């Protein structure tokens, strides 16, 4: 029925494990190869299928090492993911929006034949930490063709992204003092309309930098959002709707369920 389904039927434990069910290979992107971004590493499933593609940007002063684990973990579930370095570590969100677009075009048009052939270039997503998260919002606003956006503890000058129609998962951190959710992630979340697919997930006991180490909640619901909207995979609806309990790693969850 759904031609884009990949991998076995999902369970909690499957989505929580450090690695998903697809075995993955890497392709190095040199800075000299990258036009308009700082290079990075492409993780892809070795199995010969087509998959959506995802570009992930780090945040201010951040390197790709800060987001590496999340690239390989998402890839291990059935996606082609590039984690990038940016042109300079001090680039601001709109510049990162540009580099995320550059990262997507590198994967689709510039990567080796082994990577390009595994990509359905009509199904793309962006993700970002902090200023990279504002990059994801800005490019999503500019590229309503994208199928998903996951800003992690995001910050952008502007908190009004009501013009975005891409299905967007905002992840915030309750102890975040650098992009406090009160002024950034939650104003960003509430700016998106009820008419689009969206959700807000606030980590419990979590600082701005919780996305930069392996985190089973971020891994689980990132994959779940990408499955539902990059792959149209309704097997994953049940993880997002009504979505995670509190009381235990999840402090708060809002959504426009049902999807
Ligand atoms: Li908390």
Residue numbers in the entry: 41 to 287, 290 to 301
Pull verbatim passages from the article behind this deposition:
The crystal structure of apo-TfCut-DM was solved to 2.20 Å resolution and it contains two polypeptide chains in an asymmetric unit. Superimposing the structure with the previously reported WT TfCut yields an RMSD value of 0.255 Å for all Cα carbons, indicating that the overall structure is maintained. The catalytic triad residues, S170, D216, and H248, are located in the loop regions between α5 and β5, α6 and β7, and α7 and β8, respectively. The DM residues, S224 and I228, are located below the catalytic triad. It is worth noting that the side-chain of W195 in TfCut-DM switches from C-type conformation in the WT TfCut structure to B-type conformation according to the assignment in the previous publication. Note that W195 only exhibits B-type in the reported TfCut-DM crystal, while the corresponding residue in the previously solved IsPETase crystal shows A-, B-, and C-type conformations. Since the Trp conformation is determined by the two-residue located beneath the Trp, we presumed that W195 can still wobble in the apo-form, though alternate conformations were not captured in this crystal.
Cutinase is an esterase that belongs to the α/β-hydrolase superfamily and primarily hydrolyzes cutin from plants.
